[PDB]
Amino acid sequence: GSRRYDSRTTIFSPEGRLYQVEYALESISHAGTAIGIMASDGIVLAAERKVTSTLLEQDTSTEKLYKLNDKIAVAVAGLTADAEILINTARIHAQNYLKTYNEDIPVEILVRRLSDIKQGYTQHGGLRPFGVSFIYAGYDDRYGYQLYTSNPSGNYTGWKAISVGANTSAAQTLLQMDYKDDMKVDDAIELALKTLSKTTDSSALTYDRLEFATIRKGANDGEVYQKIFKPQEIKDILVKTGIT
Amino acid sequence: NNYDGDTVTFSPTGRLFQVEYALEAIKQGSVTVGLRSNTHAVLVALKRNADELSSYQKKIIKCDEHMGLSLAGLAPDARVLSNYLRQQCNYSSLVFNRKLAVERAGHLLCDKAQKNTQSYGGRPYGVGLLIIGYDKSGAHLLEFQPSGNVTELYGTAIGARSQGAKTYLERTLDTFIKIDGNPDELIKAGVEAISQSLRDESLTVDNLSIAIVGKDTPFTIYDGEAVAKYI
Amino acid sequence: TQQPIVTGTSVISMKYDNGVIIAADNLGSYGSLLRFNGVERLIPVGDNTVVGISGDISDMQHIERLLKDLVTENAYDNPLADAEEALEPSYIFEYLATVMYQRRSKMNPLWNAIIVAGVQSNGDQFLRYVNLLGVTYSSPTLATGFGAHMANPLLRKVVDRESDIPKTTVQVAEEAIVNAMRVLYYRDARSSRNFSLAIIDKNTGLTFKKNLQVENMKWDFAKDIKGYGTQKI
Amino acid sequence: GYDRALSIFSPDGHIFQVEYALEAVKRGTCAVGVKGKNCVVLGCERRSTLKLQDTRITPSKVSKIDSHVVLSFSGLNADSRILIEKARVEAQSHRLTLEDPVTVEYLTRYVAGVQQRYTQSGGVRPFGVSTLIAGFDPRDDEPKLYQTEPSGIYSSWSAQTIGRNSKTVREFLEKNYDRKEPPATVEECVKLTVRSLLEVVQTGAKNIEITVVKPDSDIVALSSEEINQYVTQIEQEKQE
Amino acid sequence: TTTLAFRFQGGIIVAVDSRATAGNWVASQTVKKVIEINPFLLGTMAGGSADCQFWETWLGSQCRLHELREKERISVAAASKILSNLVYQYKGAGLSMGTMICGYTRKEGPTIYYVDSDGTRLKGDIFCVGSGQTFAYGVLDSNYKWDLSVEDALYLGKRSILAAAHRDAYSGGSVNLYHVTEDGWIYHGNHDVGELFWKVKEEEGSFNNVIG
Amino acid sequence: MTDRYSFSLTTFSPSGKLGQIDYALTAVKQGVTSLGIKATNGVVIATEKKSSSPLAMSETLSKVSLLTPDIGAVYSGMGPDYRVLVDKSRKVAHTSYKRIYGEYPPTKLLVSEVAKIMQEATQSGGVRPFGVSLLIAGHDEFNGFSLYQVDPSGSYFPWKATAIGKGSVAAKTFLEKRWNDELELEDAIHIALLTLKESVEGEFNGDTIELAIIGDENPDLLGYTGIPTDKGPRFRKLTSQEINDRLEAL
Amino acid sequence: QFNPYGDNGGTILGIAGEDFAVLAGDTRNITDYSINSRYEPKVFDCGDNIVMSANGFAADGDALVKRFKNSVKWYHFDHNDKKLSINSAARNIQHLLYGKRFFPYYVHTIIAGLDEDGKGAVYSFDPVGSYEREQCRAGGAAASLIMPFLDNQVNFKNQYEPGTNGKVKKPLKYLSVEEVIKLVRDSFTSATERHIQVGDGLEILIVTKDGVRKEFYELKRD
Amino acid sequence: DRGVSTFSPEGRLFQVEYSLEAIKLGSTAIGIATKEGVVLGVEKRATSPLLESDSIEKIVEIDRHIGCAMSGLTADARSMIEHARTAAVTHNLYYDEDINVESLTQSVCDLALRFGELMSRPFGVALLIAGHDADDGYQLFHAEPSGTFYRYNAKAIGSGSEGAQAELLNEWHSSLTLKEAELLVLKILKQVMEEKLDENNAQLSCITKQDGFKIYDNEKTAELIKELKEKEAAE
Ligand SMILES: [Mg+2]
DSSP: OOGGGOOOSSOBOTTSOBHHHHHHHHHHTTSOOEEEEEETTEEEEEEEOOSOOTTBOOTTOOSSEEESSSSEEEEEEEOHHHHHHHHHHHHHHHHHHHHHHSSOOOHHHHHHHHHHHHHHHHHBSSOOOOOEEEEEEEEETTTEEEEEEEOTTSOEEEESEEEESTTHHHHHHHHHHHOOTTOOHHHHHHHHHHHHHHHOSSSSOOGGGEEEEEEESOSSSSSOEEEEOOHHHHHHHHHHTTOO | OOSOSSTTOOOTTSOOHHHHHHHHHHHHSOOEEEEEOSSEEEEEEEOOBSSSSBOBOOOEEEEETTEEEEEEEOHHHHHHHHHHHHHHHHHHHHHHSOOOOHHHHHHHHHHHHHHHHHSSSOOOOOEEEEEEEEETTEEEEEEEOTTSOEEEOSEEEESTTHHHHHHHHHHHHHHHTTOOSOHHHHHHHHHHHHGGGOOSOOOOTTTEEEEEEETTEEEEEEOGGGGGGGO | OOOOOEEEOOEEEEEETTEEEEEEEOOEEETTEEEESOOOOEEEETTTEEEEEEEEHHHHHHHHHHHHHHHHHHHTTOTTTTTTTSOOHHHHHHHHHHHHHHHHHTTOOOOEEEEEEEEOTTSOEEEEEEETTOOEEEOSEEEOTHHHHHHHHHHHTTOOSGGGSTTOOHHHHHHHHHHHHHHHHHHOTTOOSEEEEEEEETTTEEEEEEEEEOOSOOOGGGGGOOSSSSOOO | OOOOOOSOBOTTSOBHHHHHHHHHHHHSOOEEEEEOSSOEEEEEEOOTTOOSBOTTTSOOSSEESSSSEEEEEEEOHHHHHHHHHHHHHHHHHHHHHHSSOOOHHHHHHHHHHHHHHTTSSTTBOOOSEEEEEEEOOTTOOSOEEEEEOTTOOEEEBSEEEESTTHHHHHHHHHHHOOSSSOOOSHHHHHHHHHHHHHTTOSSSSTTEEEEEEETTTEEEEOOHHHHHHHHHHHHHHHOO | OOEEEEEETTEEEEEEOOOEEETTEEEESOOOOEEEOSSSOEEEOOBOHHHHHHHHHHHHHHHHHHHHHHSSOOOHHHHHHHHHHHHHHTTTSOOOBEEEEEEEETTTEEEEEEEETTSOEEEESEEEESTTHHHHHHHHHHHOOTTOOHHHHHHHHHHHHHHHHHHOTTOOSEEEEEEEETTEEEEEEEEEHHHHHHHHHHHHOOOTTSOO | OOOOOOSBSSOBOTTSOBHHHHHHHHHHHHSOOEEEEEOSSOEEEEEEOOOSOTTSOTTSSOSSEEEETTEEEEEEEOHHHHHHHHHHHHHHHIIIIIHHHSSOOOHHHHHHHHHHHHHHTTTSBTOOOOOEEEEEEEEETTTEEEEEEEOTTSOEEEBSEEEESTTHHHHHHHHHHHOOTTOOHHHHHHHHHHHHHHHOOSOOSTTTEEEEEEOSOOGGGTSOOSOSSOOOOSEEEOOHHHHHHHHHTO | OOOOOOOOOOEEEEEEOSSOEEEEEEOOEEETTEEEESOOOOSEEOSTTOEEEEEESHHHHHHHHHHHHHHHHHHHHHTTTOOOOHHHHHHHHHHHHHTTTTSOOOEEEEEEEEOTTSOEEEEEEOTTSOEEEESEEEEETTHHHHHHHHHHHTSOTTOBOTTTSSSSBOOOOOOOHHHHHHHHHHHHHHHHHHOTTOOSEEEEEEEETTEEEEEEEEOOOO | OOOTTOBOTTSOBHHHHHHHHHHHTSOOEEEEEOSSOEEEEEEOOOSSTTBOGGGOOOEEEEETTEEEEEEESGGGHHHHHHHHHHHHHHHHHHHSSOOOHHHHHHHHHHHHTOBOOOBSSOOSEEEEEEEEETTTEEEEEEEOTTSOEEEBSEEEESTTHHHHHHHHHHHOOTTOOHHHHHHHHHHHHHHHOSSOOOTTTEEEEEEETTTEEEEOOHHHHHHHHHHHHHHHHTO
16 A cells, blocks of 8 residues: 555654654755854844855845744744744744733743644654754843754754854854853854854855844843844945955 | 555455465364254354363354354454444344344355455454354355355355365265254264364363254353263 | 425224225325325335325325335345345334434434334234334224324224234225225315225235225215204205 | 554564664663652753753753652653653643642653553654653652653652663662662762762763752752762762 | 531531422432442432432542542542533533532541532532522531531431421431441431431420421 | 555655655756746746647647736746646635735735745645746735746745746856846846747747736726726736747847 | 424333332323324333333333343343343443433333342333332322322331321231232222223233243223 | 554464564563462562562552453553453443453453554553452453453463463362462462562462452562472472
8 A cells, every 4th residue: 555655754763863853954954054143132143045146136035034023033944945834833823922921922932832843743744854943043031032943853952152054063163162151242243254254165255145133132222123134234244344 | 475465455366365364364263163954053163272271262152042153263353243243133123123134144244354355454354254043044054254255055164174074064965954853963963073173182071162043942052061962 | 303394194004804904095285285186195015015104295205215225125135035035014114113213313303104004924914103203003903193083983993902803804994994084084174085095915915906085975964054053044 | 644553563572663762762861860768859961062052041851740740851852842741731630630739650650651652553653752750749758759761661769860871870879879778868869869970971060960859849950059069079089 | 309418526427308309299208319429428419310320420430440540549529520520511401410529538537529510619518408408507507516426416417307308398208317437438327207207306395386 | 545645755865855856856957948037117937838749729828827917927847737836826816815915915925825835745745746946927016026936845036037947057147147137128028038049949939939027007908997096917928929029129 | 393202191110029020001002182002012021030111202112122122132242141130220221311311211211120139129210310229119190199009008108007096107018929919900990090091901010030921901991 | 564454374463473472571470260269470570679669560450359460561551451440440330230350351352453554553461360250250361462362270471471381280270279379379480580589579469259359568478478488398
């Protein structure tokens, strides 16, 4: 019958690893590098678009950075189509929580929910996992600024600074070297862009190959503002930090 | 070989190996004999024990007051099929105030076994059954194979070494068919038939199992000292 | 739950020494409108059973098809379909009785009163009743609707208990039935003159009589009846 | 639905998927449970391959199932959350219907039941997780410590360890833990738990987590400095 | 019907009448309104007789399954709540039930739960249910003390049923007495109201209104 | 019976490749060249009508399809897969948008819905991916004119101009040299015809070329008058004659 | 509107002796003011030395008896031909009846036989399954006419020993099967006189350790 | 791969035959039926000295008149026990009586073959079901994952089964007392166990008509072990 053609996506190897999760992680390692850096006064999200073209309409394009709600955003590494399925589910969870409790969803609760969905695909259903890793940048009034990451296994962890996608080994070493706890957003912006500039597989880092975002309390008084940078604004911050 | 992984696969010569393997389970099972006259129908079954501490596995199951069977092969499958017969016998009585014909009982068993041979996921039944009964057309004896093939017979035997009993019945055909109005002599013929399938072991008091149904005889099973008379 | 629309009135029946008789008129009423005059309400099943049905006619026609289907089904893989394994009256009744009670239990009844009349394999007379409620009973005489009130009293004067059955001939039984049908025509406003009568005998088999009429009627005395009390002219 | 039998017997009578789930537990960070006379201590290893971590928000290894019971684990982290959630729901369901919180044994039996179910259900793989469940029964001062594993078997332990190099720390515990006289105080029990992890951990810095559970819903997690004092005192006695 | 149950020093007294009526017609005088759920738990029968019988012997099955799984006697709180949660699922369907779930455990002591087909579950010291409940309450309230002896408590329950049996037309027949201890309930006999009335009238000097 | 293929037929290989998606892209590569160019006041999408037989009436085979009055689509790869995607894309524009908001979806969101359908065929049980790449051109009030590409994976990208299928690599290079942000619609059509000629072997005329535009509102194509706000569709398929007229000025 | 229920009249009576039990019932079946049958058996031998009658709406009565007889058959299949004890049969019937709690069998069921100590047993059920072992129980149309008579003549209620004047009750001496049958016959003769639905014939089933025996008696047919 | 419900060429279900191998790896369980009662005994086999051995529950109560011992993948037995207990209690609810030991055993065995592609595999555990009813007296059954159950006068299952069964072959007779059976289980357990038998690594139980099913205290079993040692040293 049908059994013959079943890949069995949800099984352990003899070593106790999940084949498909491991192979999905291998897929993600070829995706454009995304970096998140958490500062005392905000969070930075920086990400590299994959070998673009001059005819790509950049100002209307979005492959890396997505908004989940007014307080939480994500950086994507892997299959964009898979990520959008999960992103829409996350947006709905945030709204369900807001409708139920009349309060914005805490960052970890949203992250756990998405991570639990990914987990399900590794344990039951016989379907392939989502070939996506997320960096979650968000704010709530309990823990303040938070950075998380989740991968196809459904495992998530908290970070001060983190990278996903390509060259994470090189990127994580560079971040570990220059990151400090008392760091500020403007410094983190510079670190994020410097790290990408060194780890990139491209010849040079330019505005058309980047997506950039900041979550700041640099919003007028006790509230949080998300800023998805425009192509011209990414070009300006590249000149300011002295990369171009 | 490559065509025995499941029941849904014909071999290049048009064979269903899973069904044939299920048929093999019957041959491994203990011998049981069936035979009838015009008034009575008799089941004789050699029960098998695990060891000397264990009980002897029961071989005969009552389906109604006028019908029952003996099994050879997977006992749980016989329980499923006998339960199904009990229900069909019972449905006929409740809905139509009518005792289920032995021939129609066979048709139902055939069709139930057939569905297991043509569908993916399932498996054939791993048991053979000998159904005896007395209905509106007299005494009857059926042989059920889990391939689906049900056969009305004067006498037969299934299980290990059943060929010896089957040849005996084939010789005695003209004698035992005429044993009308004499239950004890018809059982004697059945006990003498099943004896042709014995090696090393002989028929003891907790070894032998006999059932009978007839004109003015409800389906009744005899075990223990009730069969010492026939040893 | 429904309401009956096109209806059939009394079915009457009785046992006699060698078998059973059953009769029912050929009318399909539509309330007070005597709409359909050629409705057969006695339906034979094989050569040993006749099912008489009153009440809703659309449900009768459905039951008629079930019985037709029952004969077909019994013949499947049955070499003795016309012999030892032929349908008995008792089988046909029990089946209907099951259906009727199941249907009332789903609150969607077949709006009928049924009498199954026949002769069993061993020659025994079979006569049993079942209705929309699934209520069943047997008696030497059985009648539905108005028949119960008017026919039974007359038929019970012939066969008052079980011991009177062997003393009752087919001529006496048929006479009593035919008279009862006349009485019902006098007194039941939803009856017709035309009726069918079926005899199931253990010796002579099934005799089905169609297009019978109520005859020998008394009306002449009506001419003398004038006014409603005091009127003379 | 997906109905494929993933957990099945092999010719030698083994269910490899359940056995491969144990290999995932072997890979997981070490977890240890030690019960004293009036307390239970749960020790957990944190691999220092991950620095730049935010320890405030990162999922802690020990989880409260109720106010009186805790659960630690070794193996797949994502899998453990599913067992923890189910356990927490069952704990509240028990309080709602029985009008009494779960016993530690009951909660263990439930989690072990869930794990077992996943070893003979179609279309699912077993949990790559072994758990240590510890606490005190309601209105009871006797310490409880239980272990579960992917197959679904569970049992009570005076002391136990699971995860990577658990063979080594079990070796330590088997010679250092006396049943006739268990760690009489919180100090002694925590000390023995830290000592057992120091056989395997590497640096005694942020690699050791300790959680102390006492009777009547008295659960507290030790901080870095508090644990560091145990690490300091252990090695100073060792220099002799 | 008249059923009562009250907590005291020596445990619980359960007392019920025996009459069942269909309209004015007295169907039975020998009805059992105390369900023996198990050797430790008792339930009283008011409202729907079948509903009480069926679901309280079912409750006994659930209690048996509990102590097989948990290796421990089920609490009166848990046992009562199994019943109340069940009937609450059937709320609206037309179950009729007014019962006292009575038991004596280590952790709780003597405990009585009034359970209702509306889903009501009340813990209490004295409960009285049925058409004759008001008559029994009067005798109970004016004579009840915690420090009653087992002998006096048994009599109080018996006398309170008699008070109802006399006045309430739909109560009578006979009185069934039970005493619930920690080691289980103890049956204290069937007492015909006809004979009991005259006996009590003479010995107690009560019911002077009635000529004997 | 029952669909017993409840498991994924597309899975990650050890190297991290999703084989069936790659193979679907290989099928797209074999497909006939189609392209899209965005101008300041419009968008053009074009392809070759590769007629399987001269007896076949190639007018009955529409490679360029209207999705909404302001959105059009063209493809490269497997025609049948495209046809069913157009059916689903048309329906989803109504069910998940027009029946809710009382207006047609903006280009990017319709593209998003199409992408979602293609993504699901890449992960759902017992199916293969779609063997097509779509180029979707459209206009809406708040986003203006736009052009999107949608791949078998479900990934989609916005383009100023692009090509897919057989001679895409050469065509994209040709478009890079010609494209600027000051093109008028007629200029884009002129460039489209030039670009498309390179990948066409045989006949090159209005009967062998299918070309449509997203441009000005066409009140003549609305079918009714009386409502001022309703000004007609922006999607218009060029006629065989209209193409040939521009092939003389080529 | 369709009414799924009807009243087929009839009256049944169960009496438990010391080592026997009787279950009697009239054989008349009726609707409204018409007689359907003068002989329609109402009390049935269900096997295992148990007799049963479900009086009231005959369709539900016939359905229940049928299902119980079926339950006896399957009890034998499932439990190695074990005899179904009267107390076990009673509990089983409760579940059959309560199974239709919200669309009940409109019948008053009585069963009779011997308990596991060989003593006479009668069980009495309401329509929805509440049941009890009883010594004496009339059911059906003329139950109210019969039970007071039985209270007086079986249990000797309100009867005292002459001379004592209310001080000593008449002792509850055991009745023989012949004595019970007299009281059954007189109960039904009296019920026939004063209740229109009672008459035609009386059929009594007597249960002893030897088995089930039947006795039939004529009743007035008016 | 291949079907879960596939037959081998010899006419046996692969999965059932493989589960029987898992049971051979299980700890030893022994049952002995007498006219004074049935005795059930097990090897606990703790994997470490830190494992509190009294938490090992391989002997279990189904009803007051039915007990059960297990061997193999003991986690699989929990749902079987649950079903058994439910069946016993349900039958009491429906019939106001105790359920027959055979009928209980049959109800458990009906679960066995409910596997395919219902559960995904057979049970990896064998059960010794011991009990008493009024019809057939004291009984001991062996319930397998094949769905077959044999009644036994005495039976051993687990790793030391064939050695123990040969020993039971010689030792069992129809006039055994309960005390004689208790010692006999202890004797044979001690023979086949790897570790030295004591009250902590072995457990006894019995079912009698009067007292019902009872698991033995470690103090009670310890005395029977000491009684055993002395009587073996007595010759
Ligand atoms: Mg009368």
